[PDB]
Structures are given as C-alpha cells and as structure tokens.
Design an enzyme around this catalytic site. Structure first.
Site, short mmCIF file in Angstrom:
data_model
loop_
_atom_site.label_atom_id
_atom_site.label_comp_id
_atom_site.label_asym_id
_atom_site.label_seq_id
_atom_site.Cartn_x
_atom_site.Cartn_y
_atom_site.Cartn_z
N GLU B 62 0.86 -1.21 0.00
CA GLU B 62 0.00 0.00 0.00
C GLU B 62 0.88 1.25 0.00
O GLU B 62 0.52 2.22 -0.68
CB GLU B 62 -0.95 0.01 1.19
N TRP B 84 -8.48 -2.10 -0.27
CA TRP B 84 -9.09 -0.98 -1.04
C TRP B 84 -10.18 -1.49 -1.99
O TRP B 84 -10.78 -0.65 -2.67
CB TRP B 84 -8.00 -0.20 -1.80
N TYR B 110 -4.65 9.91 -1.70
CA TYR B 110 -3.33 9.86 -1.11
C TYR B 110 -2.13 10.11 -1.96
O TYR B 110 -1.72 11.19 -2.10
CB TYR B 110 -3.17 8.58 -0.31
N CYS B 170 -7.78 10.27 5.62
CA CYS B 170 -7.60 10.23 7.08
C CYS B 170 -6.21 10.73 7.46
O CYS B 170 -6.12 11.71 8.21
CB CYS B 170 -7.80 8.82 7.59
N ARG B 190 -6.82 13.11 10.98
CA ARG B 190 -8.06 13.81 11.40
C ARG B 190 -9.04 12.84 12.05
O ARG B 190 -9.88 13.31 12.84
CB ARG B 190 -8.74 14.45 10.19
N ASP B 193 -9.57 5.02 13.50
CA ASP B 193 -10.04 3.73 14.05
C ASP B 193 -8.86 3.09 14.80
O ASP B 193 -7.96 2.50 14.14
CB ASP B 193 -10.55 2.82 12.94
N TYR B 233 -14.53 1.61 17.89
CA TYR B 233 -15.88 1.05 17.63
C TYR B 233 -16.30 0.13 18.79
O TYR B 233 -15.48 -0.66 19.29
CB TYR B 233 -15.93 0.36 16.26
C1 LIG Z 1 -5.19 1.08 7.04
N1 LIG Z 1 -6.44 0.55 6.54
C2 LIG Z 1 -7.34 1.47 5.89
C3 LIG Z 1 -8.55 1.58 6.76
C4 LIG Z 1 -8.49 1.17 8.08
N2 LIG Z 1 -9.53 1.24 8.91
C5 LIG Z 1 -10.67 1.69 8.43
N3 LIG Z 1 -11.75 1.78 9.19
C6 LIG Z 1 -12.90 2.25 8.69
N4 LIG Z 1 -13.96 2.32 9.49
N5 LIG Z 1 -13.04 2.65 7.41
C7 LIG Z 1 -12.02 2.62 6.55
N6 LIG Z 1 -12.14 3.01 5.28
C8 LIG Z 1 -10.74 2.12 7.04
N7 LIG Z 1 -9.67 2.05 6.23
C9 LIG Z 1 -6.77 -0.81 6.68
C10 LIG Z 1 -5.96 -1.63 7.43
C11 LIG Z 1 -6.25 -2.97 7.59
C12 LIG Z 1 -7.37 -3.51 7.00
C13 LIG Z 1 -7.68 -4.96 7.18
O1 LIG Z 1 -8.83 -5.26 7.41
N8 LIG Z 1 -6.74 -5.89 7.09
C14 LIG Z 1 -6.99 -7.24 6.58
C15 LIG Z 1 -7.45 -7.26 5.12
C16 LIG Z 1 -6.31 -6.99 4.15
C17 LIG Z 1 -6.42 -7.90 2.96
O2 LIG Z 1 -7.00 -8.96 3.12
O3 LIG Z 1 -5.91 -7.58 1.87
C18 LIG Z 1 -5.76 -8.09 6.65
O4 LIG Z 1 -5.70 -9.16 6.00
O5 LIG Z 1 -4.83 -7.68 7.37
C19 LIG Z 1 -8.20 -2.70 6.25
C20 LIG Z 1 -7.91 -1.35 6.09
O1 LIG Z 2 -5.77 4.97 7.26
C1 LIG Z 2 -6.91 5.03 7.74
C2 LIG Z 2 -8.12 5.30 7.01
C3 LIG Z 2 -9.30 5.33 7.67
N1 LIG Z 2 -9.40 5.13 9.03
C4 LIG Z 2 -10.74 5.11 9.70
C5 LIG Z 2 -11.10 6.32 10.56
C6 LIG Z 2 -12.63 6.24 10.55
O2 LIG Z 2 -13.14 5.25 11.43
C7 LIG Z 2 -12.89 5.86 9.09
C8 LIG Z 2 -13.02 7.03 8.16
O3 LIG Z 2 -14.31 7.62 8.36
P1 LIG Z 2 -14.48 9.21 8.58
O4 LIG Z 2 -13.48 9.61 9.63
O5 LIG Z 2 -14.22 9.86 7.22
O6 LIG Z 2 -15.92 9.38 9.07
O7 LIG Z 2 -11.74 5.07 8.69
C9 LIG Z 2 -8.27 4.84 9.79
O8 LIG Z 2 -8.31 4.63 11.00
N2 LIG Z 2 -7.09 4.83 9.10
#
Ligand SMILES: CN(Cc1cnc2nc(N)nc(N)c2n1)c1ccc(C(=O)N[C@@H](CCC(=O)O)C(=O)O)cc1
Ligand SMILES: O=c1ccn([C@H]2C[C@H](O)[C@@H](COP(=O)(O)O)O2)c(=O)[nH]1
Ligand SMILES: CN(Cc1cnc2nc(N)nc(N)c2n1)c1ccc(C(=O)N[C@@H](CCC(=O)O)C(=O)O)cc1
Ligand SMILES: O=c1ccn([C@H]2C[C@H](O)[C@@H](COP(=O)(O)O)O2)c(=O)[nH]1
Lengths: 289, 287
Positions: B62, B84, B110, B170, B190, B193, B233
């Site tokens: 990533e 993604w 990004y 984020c 900003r 999670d 959460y």
């Molecule tokens: C950094 N990042 C982006 C991320 C993280 N938390 C979020 N949380 C929320 N609520 N919303 C998002 N869009 C979000 N995005 C992540 C990090 C880990 C995984 C995750 O679930 N990891 C799994 C899935 C990865 C995969 O299978 O390719 C793993 O196998 O480790 C997802 C998003």
């Molecule tokens: O790298 C990242 C990308 C996203 N988020 C989380 C923060 C929030 O729970 C959610 C984005 O939602 P908003 O903050 O835009 O509402 O994804 C992370 O913790 N890390």
C-alpha cells in the site's frame, strides 16, 4: 500542570532538551519536534498569558481580518496594528519575486484560504464574494446540522498558492470536534516561535473557538495547539528564563455581548476580556533580513 | 511509557474516558480528541505492534502504491491486497456519485496528492508524469540541500479534489524535521479507528520515514502520530480489552539492503522485518 503551566513547561523543555539549529535567518534556535499544549475554554476561560502582557487588541483585529478573508496589511495599519507591515513592504514583496504586487498586498494568505480556498487571486482589494470554497461557513453549518462529523477541517496550506503568498502559513490547519455540546479546536502549527508568536497564536485560535461556539449554540471545550518545529530563538533565552520565574495568575474570562448573523460581521466591541491581570513589561525582539 | 505502551495507553484512555458517539453509520464509538503517540525509529526499530499480528505485506505494498502516485485498487488486488477493494467497488463508487468511474479507480486519493497535487485527474491508468506539485520529491531535495527548513509538508488534504475521491483522506498531512542527522516525521490524522486502522498507519508512516532517511543519507529519528477524532468502535471493545492483557515484546528491526535513485522504484525485496515476534490470537472487523 494545567493552563499556563503547559506553556511554561514547553519553554523549559526547549531550554533543557532543545537541539541547536541555525536557521532560515541570521540567528539560532533551540528546537524540539511535535509538542502539544491543551487549554480549557470552560467557564468562559480564554488562555491569554498572565506571565507576559499579550497585545489583545492585536489578536482580535488580526483574527477578524482573517475571518473576513482580507489580505491587505494596510487595513491592519489603519487600526494601528503593525504586525503585517514588514512582510507587506516594497522590499519584502520584491525579495519574494512579487514585483507587480501593490505595497501591503500579502497575497492569498490565511483568511483568503479560510473563505475562498482554490479561488484565483487578483489583488487584496478584489471582490471574492462566492469565489472558492468557504471552509469556515461550511464548518459552521456542519456544527449546526451534523456535529459528530470527522472532516471539519479548515486549512490555509494550499501548495499551489504558496508562491503568491508573502509568507507560507504557520498556523496551517485547524480541526473542530463536538462532545457534550462543547466545541473543541485542534490547530496544527508547522513552526512556532515559542517566545513571541505562540502566545499570540494560542489567544487567536482560543478566541476563534469561543466566537464559533456562540455562532452555533455550543459551549467552548478545549483548544489544543500541536506544533511541528517549536523553537526558542537564542536572542529570547535570557528574557524567557525571567518569564519562567513569574507565578501565573488565573486566566481571564471572555464576555460575548452578542453574536451577529454572519461571523465576518463580529467587531471588537461585541466581546471583551474580564479580569486580565498580567505582570510587568519585558521585551522579545523578532529577527529576519 | 515508551514504545508500544504508547498505543496500549491510548486504547485504555478511550475505553475509560471516551465519549459515546453514534457515528457516520448505524453503530457507536467511544471517542477522544487530540491524543499523540511518539515512537523511536533509532537502532533500526520500527513500531509494528507485537500485541497483535500486523499484515506487514499489506503495509509495504500500500505504501509503495502511495509513493508511486497510484490510485488503482486493482493493482493492489493483483498482489492479493484486498484493503481498497470495498471502496473501489461499483456499488461504493455509485453511492458517491462517481457513475463514470471504472471499478477500482478511487480518484486522486493519497499518493496522487503526494506526487501530483493540483494536477487535473482523468483516470487511474492516465500518465501523470511531470503533472502537479511533487511534494515528496521536493521534500527529499530539501532534506539533502536544507534540512533545517520548517515547511517540509506533504498533504493529501485538497479541498477541491475531495468530491472526486472514493473517501476523503484520514492520514492527511505529514511534516518532516531534522536534528543531529536524524529524520523525524509527524503525521496529522483527522480520524483514527484505533482498533483496526491506527496500528496499520503507524507501520506505514514509520516505514516511509525509514525509506526517506536512506534516500538522503540521514538516520531515522521519531515518528509522531497526532490524532483528531481518536475512536474505538463498540464492536472492538471486548477484543481490545484482551489485547491489553498481552505483554509487548521488543519491536522488530527494519533491514534495508539498498536504496534506489528514485523513491517510487523501491520494491518489497529491498528491505525486510528482522525479529518480528507477534502474539497469536486475532480478530477485529471493519465498519
Ligand atoms: C489502514 N487501513 C485502511 C482503513 C483502516 N480502517 C478503516 N476503518 C474504517 N472504518 N473505514 C475505513 N475506510 C478504514 N480504512 C486498513 C488496514 C487494515 C485492514 C484490514 O482489514 N486488514 C486485513 C485485510 C487486508 C487484505 O485482506 O488484503 C488483513 O488481511 O490484514 C483494512 C484497512
Ligand atoms: O488509514 C486510515 C483510514 C481510515 N481510518 C478510519 C477512521 C474512521 O473510522 C474511518 C473514516 O471515516 P471518517 O473519519 O471519514 O468518518 O476510517 C483509519 O483509522 N485509518
Ligand atoms: C503572530 N505574529 C506573527 C509572527 C510571530 N512571530 C514571528 N516570529 C518570527 N521569527 N518571524 C515571523 N515572521 C513571525 N511572525 C506576531 C505576533 C506578535 C508580533 C509583535 O511584534 N508584537 C508586538 C506588537 C507589534 C506592534 O507593535 O504592532 C508586541 O509588542 O507584542 C508580531 C507578529
Ligand atoms: O503566527 C506565526 C507566524 C510565524 N511564526 C514564526 C515561527 C518561526 O519561528 C518563524 C519563521 O517561519 P518559518 O521560518 O518557519 O517560515 O515564524 C510564529 O511563531 N507564528
């Protein structure tokens, strides 16, 4: 360890653990990276330093000037505010390659970005009404309709407008947050003159948080200053060591007599400091050229 | 305390003092505002959590994808990185009014901002070479020529591009700093999670600092993560309480075999984690 002690402890830490670091200008600094200060705005408190008299009229008139989207230094010089005259002078604009820029026209600095992000800049006297993204109006609306929103960002850091600015921003990005009907503001400042500028900046964004709270029916919560390069200049050291000997008095209260329909219509007469009891006079000169 | 205790303390603080807050979607969070964590990158250390196994290969691929200026989610899916896929799906793009956007095309997210700030976006497969401001390249040059500079800012927060993005950023703004030939990075995030995303983000920007340091002949210093809305959460609470019972082990070390001339030409084969000894257990689901 709360309140003004936050600021005094930051000064000690830079004096005791700071790293020597010549700098941009002809003069040196002690410097640390990433320090944070938290200030309570509860019970009408506003963190105006008591160990040093702060130029409160300056803080107010400059912030109202930012809030209006104004970029003309001459508007501040008219109210006998001189803090932007240097950077708006023929010499300084010329040293920045801004030769066709009228004296006192700073370019699309702070306020312009707050109220008109992405709008094409002409001159400081142009009419920008309805041009660009009004970040401040958008945030005020979100605070009324959806206060839990995690994207309430107001930035002056516009990579495309930096060359047009007299100086690139220091207080670059603010975020707002609501819990228990309290409004909090975090400021990211990339570079902080801890001696001269930072006490001013604390008063600036604290006031902004108070004013914004009264516009949307919320109480003030916390102001949080997060710094990048926090430094004391070598010239300020002996003065600051004296400031550290002074026992802080309680922080003044902000009284707001009224809030207008539009935030840009606030005037200095609409609010005042109650109980501001600073100590004796002590100078701190700022260096450039 | 230092190290991983920075993260575990943050979790405790949100569980004990966090404010309840129904959020963007039908679920709740405990939330605080403005907390900070500091991590040493000295003696080759990289703060990859040991109390929970982090998907290191995901972090690396990533970040290399960000550094390239890439915005195609399908490039990550090809390397069996699925993080993604959800946000680049037909459904999600449509829910965001991006009907003329091909599946996997996330918009100018990004990396695009890192390498092409202000460039007009077409599709994720367009050639952006020499378009917009290359903030990362500018910073790398400033670290060689003028490391004391206090405007070494790389931002993804472009108010004008937010509508074209699948999600607004984020991890939105990084600043770089130098003292005693050590490179430090502060990240402004900003929204965090703390359960799922923040551990990942800590690994991501720590790695970037290590990589950037080797590009310009500096040693790594500190990584500082400053949060806006730091939230847990409600669904993650019980799992996180378990994670806190786990005694952290020393962080692993990052070994860099070589550094290429241009940072976008880094590949996973050029570095690896030495001594990564996480605990076994698991869990935590997104939303
Ligand atoms: C950094 N990042 C982006 C991320 C993280 N938390 C979020 N949380 C929320 N609520 N919303 C998002 N869009 C979000 N995005 C992540 C990090 C880990 C995984 C995750 O679930 N990891 C799994 C899935 C990865 C995969 O299978 O390719 C793993 O196998 O480790 C997802 C998003
Ligand atoms: O790298 C990242 C990308 C996203 N988020 C989380 C923060 C929030 O729970 C959610 C984005 O939602 P908003 O903050 O835009 O509402 O994804 C992370 O913790 N890390
Ligand atoms: C907020 N601000 C911007 C500021 C602060 N510190 C800086 N420090 C440096 N090194 N360089 C700057 N360009 C700079 N700019 C300030 C704050 C106070 C004054 C100042 O000169 N205060 C005078 C009042 C100036 C006046 O007479 O109007 C005082 O007596 O307190 C200047 C700039
Ligand atoms: O509101 C402001 C504006 C400027 N500065 C100071 C911080 C730096 O010491 C100095 C020079 O800025 P840069 O060198 O970082 O551009 O300006 C402040 O402290 N506060």
């Amino acid at each position: 360890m709360e309140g003004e002690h936050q600021y005094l402890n930051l000064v000690r830490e830079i004096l005791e653990r700071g790293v020597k670091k010549d700098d941009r200008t002809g003069t040196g600094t002690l410097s640390i990276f990433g320090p944070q200060m938290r200030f309570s705005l509860r019970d009408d408190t506003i963190p105006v330093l008591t160990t040093k008299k702060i130029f409160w009229r300056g803080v107010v008139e400059e912030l109202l000037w930012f809030i209006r989207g104004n970029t003309d230094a001459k508007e501040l010089a008219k109210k006998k505010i001189h803090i932007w005259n240097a950077n708006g002078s023929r010499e300084f604009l010329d040293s920045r390659g801004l030769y066709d820029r009228a004296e006192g026209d700073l370019g699309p600095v702070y306020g312009f970005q707050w109220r008109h992000f992405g709008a094409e800049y002409d001159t400081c006297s142009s009419d920008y009404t309805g041009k660009g993204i009004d970040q401040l109006a958008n945030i005020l609306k979100t605070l009324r309709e959806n206060p839990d929103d995690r994207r309430m960002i107001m930035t002056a850091w516009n990579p495309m407008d930096l060359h047009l600015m007299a100086l690139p921003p220091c207080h670059m990005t603010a975020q707002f947050y609501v819990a228990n009907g309290e409004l909090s503001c975090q400021l990211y400042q990339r570079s902080g003159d801890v001696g001269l500028g930072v006490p001013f900046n604390i008063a600036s964004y604290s006031l902004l948080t108070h004013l914004m709270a009264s516009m949307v029916g919320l109480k003030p919560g916390e102001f949080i200053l997060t710094l990048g390069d926090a430094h004391i200049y070598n010239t300020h050291i002996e003065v600051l060591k004296k400031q550290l000997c002074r026992v802080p008095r309680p922080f003044p209260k902000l009284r707001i007599l009224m809030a207008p329909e539009k935030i840009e219509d606030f005037t200095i007469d609409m609010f005042y400091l109650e109980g501001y009891q600073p100590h004796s006079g002590n100078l701190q000169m700022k260096m450039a050229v």
